Design a protein around this ligand. Structure first.
Ligand SMILES: O=c1ccn([C@@H]2O[C@H](COP(=O)(O)OP(=O)(O)O[C@H]3O[C@H](CO)[C@@H](O)[C@H](O)[C@H]3O)[C@@H](O)[C@H]2O)c(=O)[nH]1
Ligand SMILES: O=c1ccn([C@@H]2O[C@H](COP(=O)(O)OP(=O)(O)O[C@H]3O[C@H](CO)[C@@H](O)[C@H](O)[C@H]3O)[C@@H](O)[C@H]2O)c(=O)[nH]1
Ligand SMILES: [Mn+2]
Ligand SMILES: [Mn+2]
Lengths: 255, 255
């Protein structure tokens, strides 16, 4: 497939590590779709070169530049910087359908069946289940949709200061319409849910397709012992992330 | 309506306080349906008399008695005591459709529109969103269904040691089938979600129809100052519970 793709995002080198591990995991599980990543000029050359290898397409977005359509909204609402860059995922009209995935997610199995879904499909967010988690979602690139989202961001902002509030407000039929737009929780398993509802994780966790390290601490914020091959019910996943980073990404950064 | 009813449960005097406040809140918001409560012999006479006043029907269930259909399963799986008593809600065949509600819930607005739903309708559980929270659900009394649930409880038990695991396993199409069986989160707003996703609560919390004090600490475990009329983003709801308990239930317990 050349007109469908997984799309991730990174505005710095820290999250680029996540994007590289994510991209590697998608290749590892033999995706037949394209891989694209939105980056900013703040991503260093070393990381960019690595990204050029793992991803089929590397797009550069600079909302700090007056030439960007989102620049004005950025001046007005500074807290939406990351959100505004993220919204450019809808500008990738070279693709007919895409699956946006946070840079802090990890794929455990082929998830190409997500392309069977329609915009806007996403998994329920723990905490407030009638809102979908914007870390993983199926959408359709469109300049019109992009302009509409940018307009809402400018006009009213986001109820949670991030893209999730904005997207839930725009795609507000999600909770009460079309069960097919509710992606199973295993396509965006928030690593925190392993504590909140451990019994559920024990019963269904083994079916996890995508792990999302939602929260303050990211995989790259841990120390990993290459000897014992473990970071210093959440480790199992963190160790998979590090096994991939250690085995595939680090050597790649060294060219 | 005489063949439809809200059904709650209490095995002791502590939860009877909750059942009385819940029942009062349903009357306060002018429900046109019947009110029923499952009780056990452990509920004292004082509480029972109060329950006989607030509820249209008080049913007594004693799984500790060999004559009860669930007794044997209780001997085999002791951790399911409360669950087995709860399952008797399906034995109330005098009603064609019911809304089960935990004794630790509180109604903030008329919710008779829930009777438009079909079994099994329930709200998403925070923590693991692909499981429904069993604190509030629409079901259809049936001896066959009761027997089927009892059989599963005996044969395999519950993945979480309580009724929620059992019910989710039995009604396992919930997460992927019929969006109408997904009751809006405001029909079972877990008081904890006020912390997890505060932004969401600020944006939609005002629409809460049912508050659920899910967790270790219940309303009756707090001290309430009748002078300042406040317990000693969660108080607002706890104070409503206590206003009702203080204003309507306490005087009732005094006859
Ligand atoms: O400096 C930054 C911060 C974020 N990102 C990108 O933005 C995504 C979202 O940010 P992240 O740090 O992963 O946020 P979360 O821990 O996943 O959480 C936030 O984002 C979730 C989904 O986007 C919501 O469910 C939460 O409420 C919100 O707090 C990341 O994966 C990256 O792709 C960057 O590129 N650079
Ligand atoms: O000694 C007891 C304990 C419970 N109950 C009844 O059982 C209901 C369920 O128990 P509760 O104490 O309210 O449990 P929760 O705090 O709501 O939580 C549990 O029950 C929820 C829904 O039933 C699940 O979402 C949770 O995972 C589970 O931990 C209560 O409302 C009562 O009606 C009694 O009558 N007597
Ligand atoms: Mn994330
Ligand atoms: Mn409860």
């Amino acid at each position: 497939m050349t007109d469908q793709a997984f799309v991730t995002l990174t505005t710095n080198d820290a999250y680029a590590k996540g994007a590289l591990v994510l991209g590697s995991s998608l290749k590892q599980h033999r995706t037949s779709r394209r891989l694209a990543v939105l980056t900013t000029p703040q991503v260093s050359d070393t990381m960019r070169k690595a990204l050029e290898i793992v991803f089929d397409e590397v797009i550069t977005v600079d909302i700090l530049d007056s030439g960007d359509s989102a620049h004005l909204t950025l001046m007005k609402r500074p807290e939406l910087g990351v959100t505004l860059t993220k919204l450019h995922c809808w500008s990738l009209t070279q693709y007919s359908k895409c699956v946006f995935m946070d840079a802090d997610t990890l794929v455990l199995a082929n998830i190409d069946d997500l392309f069977e879904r329609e915009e806007l499909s996403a998994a329920p967010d723990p905490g407030w289940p009638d809102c979908f988690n914007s870390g993983v979602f199926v959408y359709q690139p469109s300049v019109e949709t992009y302009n509409q989202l940018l307009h809402v961001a400018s006009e009213q902002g986001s109820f949670d200061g991030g893209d999730q509030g904005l997207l839930n407000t725009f795609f507000n039929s999600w909770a009460t319409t079309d069960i097919r737009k509710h992606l199973p929780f295993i396509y965006n398993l928030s690593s925190i849910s392993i504590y909140s509802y451990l019994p559920a994780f024990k019963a269904f966790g083994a079916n996890a397709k995508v792990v999302h390290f939602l929260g303050q601490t990211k995989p790259w914020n841990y120390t990993y012992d290459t000897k014992t091959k473990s970071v210093r019910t959440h480790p199992q996943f963190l160790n998979v992330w590090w096994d991939i980073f250690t085995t595939s990404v680090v050597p790649l950064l060294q060219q």
